[PDB]
Write a protein that binds this ligand. Structure first.
Ligand SMILES: CCN(CC)C(=O)c1ccc(Nc2nc(OCC3CCCCC3)c3[nH]cnc3n2)cc1
Length: 273
């Protein structure tokens, strides 16, 4: 179950953007913490749109997935506020935001070793989920958060976490699914109920492509009809700018889901460079 947070202990501050049928805000939670100390803690507030309240079950199931498992590379959920009409998910607030924006802002500053450390961390998180037979269903650079920047001076690497998947692709309208090509794998375009552990290996490949492309979005120039035809013609993504991980990307985005490598194998490949 989810810890219930009182509407009166939450303050909503600035809008940070939107997700799928959600609005996202920075906020503050008043709480009693360890030793009975009172705290005013920064939080990330995710609000399901009133118009799409019929998705509330999938909205919360997405975060519940993340919450029943504990791992260093998985975002922390603090609880939920159903107080009122609103359906509110309360999560930890990460200092440096999402990776897709960070890659773009810091293009001329991110080198191959940084990308490899990030890829290894994401692969570790996905290996944990695979070993627990937990499907994420929406692996992408927008859903990777940057906790700590790299510090060459101290030799410290960056540190990321994987966020929750949001409303599942098994209940979303087809036009949203099509726009999410090529993160959504071909078999889930055929039938979103084909969502499986193999789904996440495909999307991991798409996310590595993002990491290697300075925050470009693959196939963004293609409209939804042309994205569908891309899958129907069995195309692959072009090798990124920095081509060091192109082979791994292509091996991961295999049109045969049963041939996509395990995350253990993926980690072995990453460690070999
Ligand atoms: C000055 C420019 N920056 C970057 C430095 C910021 O303003 C910024 C934005 C967000 C955070 N933190 C954040 N972001 C999340 O999601 C990512 C956001 C979701 C919806 C909109 C896009 C971003 C989160 N999810 C779950 N805990 C989160 N914490 C930190 C800083």
């Amino acid at each position: 179950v989810f810890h219930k947070i009182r509407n009166e202990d939450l303050i909503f501050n600035e809008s940070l953007g939107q997700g799928t049928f959600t609005k996202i805000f920075k906020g503050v939670r008043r709480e009693v913490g360890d030793y009975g100390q009172l705290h005013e803690t920064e939080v990330l507030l995710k609000v399901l749109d009133k118009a799409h309240r019929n998705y509330s079950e999938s909205f919360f199931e997405a975060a519940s997935m993340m919450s029943k498992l504990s791992h260093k590379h998985l975002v922390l959920n603090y609880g939920v506020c159903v107080c009122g009409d609103e359906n509110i998910l309360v999560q930890e607030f990460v200092k440096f935001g999402s990776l897709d924006t960070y890659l773009k802002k810091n293009k001329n500053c991110i080198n191959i070793l940084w990308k490899l450390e990030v890829a290894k961390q994401l692969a570790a998180a996905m290996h944990f989920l695979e070993e627990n037979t937990l499907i994420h269903g929406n692996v992408c650079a927008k859903n990777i958060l940057l906790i700590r920047e790299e510090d060459r001076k101290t030799g410290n690497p960056p540190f990321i976490k994987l966020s929750d998947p949001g409303i599942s692709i098994t209940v979303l309208p087809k036009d949203i699914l099509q726009e999410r090509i090529p993160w959504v794998p071909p078999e889930c375009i055929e039938n979103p109920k084909n969502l499986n552990l193999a789904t996440d290996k495909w999307s991991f490949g798409t996310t590595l492509w993002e990491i290697c492309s300075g925050g470009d979005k693959p196939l963004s120039a293609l409209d939804s009809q042309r994205k569908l035809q891309f899958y129907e013609d069995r195309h692959q993504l072009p090798a990124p700018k920095a081509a060091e991980l192109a082979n791994l990307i292509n091996n991961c985005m295999d049109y045969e889901p049963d041939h996509r490598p395990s995350f253990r194998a993926i980690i072995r490949d990453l460690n070999s460079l």
